[PDB]
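REQUEST FORM: STRUCTURE PREDICTION
Request ID: SP-0412
Submitted by: Lab K.M.
Chain count: 1
Length (residues): 139
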Amino acid sequence: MGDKEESKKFSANLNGTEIAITYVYKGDKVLKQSSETKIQFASIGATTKEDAAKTLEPLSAKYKNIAGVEEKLTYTDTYAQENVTIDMEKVDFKALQGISGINVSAEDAKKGITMAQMELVMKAAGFKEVKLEHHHHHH
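STATUS: Completed
RESULT:
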């Protein structure tokens, strides 16, 4: 019935990395996990984009072809935004355990991410959801 596939976007600013995951779920199943990690320089140990890539490539190359896992390293000089898109319709959870891990709950990451899981599990992770709204602060 049209069936809205809805985006749930949380954003945790930790370790110097701004991780905002926009995961789209349809029904009770999450289907696309947009894990957009805004990494800042200096904190990563990189002073230049070259040195940054030499640190990032090894990690971003882990996704490779696990599934519909898109790795967009967008970096100018001041920051490196790793826009990740994990497709949960072809996911291999074998390799994923050594990639993204998602070791917040072994039940979630190993058995297949479910909306009930991602919800309770991201709440358990202590992350703050922004939904998709930033102007939520009326006054």
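NOTES: Strands lie at 6-14, 17-26, 29-40, 70-75, 79-87, 129-131.
Reviewed by: T.R.
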